[PDB]
Amino acid sequence: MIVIFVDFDYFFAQVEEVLNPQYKGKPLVVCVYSGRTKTSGAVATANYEARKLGVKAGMPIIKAMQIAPSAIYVPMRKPIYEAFSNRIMNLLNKHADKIEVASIDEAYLDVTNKVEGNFENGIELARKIKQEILEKEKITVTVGVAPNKILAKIIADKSKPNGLGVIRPTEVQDFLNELDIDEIPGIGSVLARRLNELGIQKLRDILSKNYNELEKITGKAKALYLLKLAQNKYSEPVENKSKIPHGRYLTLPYNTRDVKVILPYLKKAINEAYNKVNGIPMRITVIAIMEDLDILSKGKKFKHGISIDNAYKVAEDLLRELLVRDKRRNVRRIGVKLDNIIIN
DNA sequence: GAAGCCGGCG
DNA sequence: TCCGCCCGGCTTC
Numbered sequence: 624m625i626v627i628f629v630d631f632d633y634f635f636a637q638v639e640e641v642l643n644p645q646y647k648g649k650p651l652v653v654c655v656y657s658g659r660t661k662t663s664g665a666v667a668t669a670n671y672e673a674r675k676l677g678v679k680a681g682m683p684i685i686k687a688m689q690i691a692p693s694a695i696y697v698p699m700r701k702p703i704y705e706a707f708s709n710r711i712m713n714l715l716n717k718h719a720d721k722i723e724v725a726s727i728d729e730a731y732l733d734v735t736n737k738v739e740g741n742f743e744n745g746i747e748l749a750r751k752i753k754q755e756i757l758e759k760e761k762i763t764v765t766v767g768v769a770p771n772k773i774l775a776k777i778i779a780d781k782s783k784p785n786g787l788g789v790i791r792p793t794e795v796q797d798f799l800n801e802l803d804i805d806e807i808p809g810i811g812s813v814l815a816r817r818l819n820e821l822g823i824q825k826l827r828d829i830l831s832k833n834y835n836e837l838e839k840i841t842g843k844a845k846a847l848y849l850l851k852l853a854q855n856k857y858s859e860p861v862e863n864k865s866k867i868p869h870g871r872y873l874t875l876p877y878n879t880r881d882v883k884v885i886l887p888y889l890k891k892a893i894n895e896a897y898n899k900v901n902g903i904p905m906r907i908t909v910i911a912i913m914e915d916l917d918i919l920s921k922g923k924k925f926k927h928g929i930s931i932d933n934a935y936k937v938a939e940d941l942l943r944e945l946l947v948r949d950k951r952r953n954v955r956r957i958g959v960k961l962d963n964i965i966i967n
Numbered sequence: 968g969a970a971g972c973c974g975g976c977g
Numbered sequence: 978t979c980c981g982c983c984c985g986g987c988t989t990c
């Protein structure tokens with residue numbers, strides 16, 4: 624198992640820098656707004672000059688200006704960032720036996736057969752990938768090379784920005800021993816707080832505690848996952864799937880409960896969603912906003928995926944099922960979501 | 968099966 | 978130390 628994890632450096636801001644080179648070297652902030660009850664905005668991405676002045680993602684925009692008065696504040700343009708992401712993902716495509724797209728800026732590559740099981744050529748490949756993405760798209764990325772997915776990510780994370788993390792087969796055991804508990808994917812701040820207040824600060828501190836004492840705080844799946852990881856037993860493979868969802872939402876001319884009216888609009892959302900997709904989804908979800916604006920949704924999974932034609936029937940049903948769950952209340956806006964896409 | 972609560976993520 | 982046509986795990990009825 625040779626995994627190369629690729630993560631695009633401050634992606635949205637970096638794209639803005641490429642389109643307008645005048646921002647390069649100046650503090651830049653990409654802003655995301657909301658048209659809900661309040662119209663206020665927040666930080667989506669800050670470049671490193673902004674991050675250096677203390678600007679972080681999710682920071683309310685008002686606050687970011689307090690600490691970065693000198694920064695340039697721009698609106699978010701998803702479609703462009705998506706186009707970039709699309710292009711770069713394709714470049715990676717031809718460098719991997721198997722490729723898993725995790726998000727708009729994160730991919731995992733299995734390169735084991737590519738580099739003939741030789742870990743050194745694997746590192747050489749990562750360097751090539753870095754170099755190519757920079758030359759083709761003028762985007763700098765951070766990569767992580769490791770025997771499994773989770774390590775490959777965890778080391779890239781320690782190597783940002785424009786870095787190249789490497790954990791070799793022989794370094795693994797020590798690395799697990801070395802690892803702080805909160806540094807591990809799946810453990811947010813809240814879980815860490817609770818784990819530290821029970822004597823666990825490092826990954827190897829799990830071994831001494833009994834599985835039941837752990838579960839109580841952890842859950843079920845995480846406990847198991849932690850156990851295997853600490854013992855270096857984790858090795859979930861890289862799959863040919865994209866974790867990025869694609870959806871279309873359409874407003875109705877007026878509020879209704881009538882399927883014959885809603886369907887033509889659902890059918891259109893489905894069409895537009897399937898055009899955005901480059902594979903076969905394994906889940907369809909019908910989302911419906913009611914008069915009082917609250918959300919009602921429901922999906923179905925398909926082991927072997929759903930094709931465009933067969934989605935009309937299923938989506939229709941899901942809609943009826945939503946209308947049987949909420950009787951005597953009209954819809955306003957419908958949408959469909961497609962995820963768990965199988966690639967290639 | 969499914970509503971709702973909670974931690975985590977992008 | 979913030980929001981999501983959020984999203985999955987888990988607990989509960």
Ligand SMILES: Nc1nc2c(ncn2[C@H]2CC[C@@H](COP(=O)(O)OP(=O)(O)OP(=O)(O)O)O2)c(=O)[nH]1
Nearest residue numbers: 631632633634635665667668680681728977979980
């Ligand atoms: N509201 C909010 N949005 C966030 C937050 N973190 C990320 N986002 C959204 C906006 C940008 C997008 C990508 O963020 P990422 O951290 O995945 O990636 P990045 O911007 O390249 O930075 P990095 O390389 O450090 O991960 O997801 C957050 O804490 N709050």
Ligand SMILES: [Ca+2]
Nearest residue numbers: 631632633728
């Ligand atoms: Ca990134």
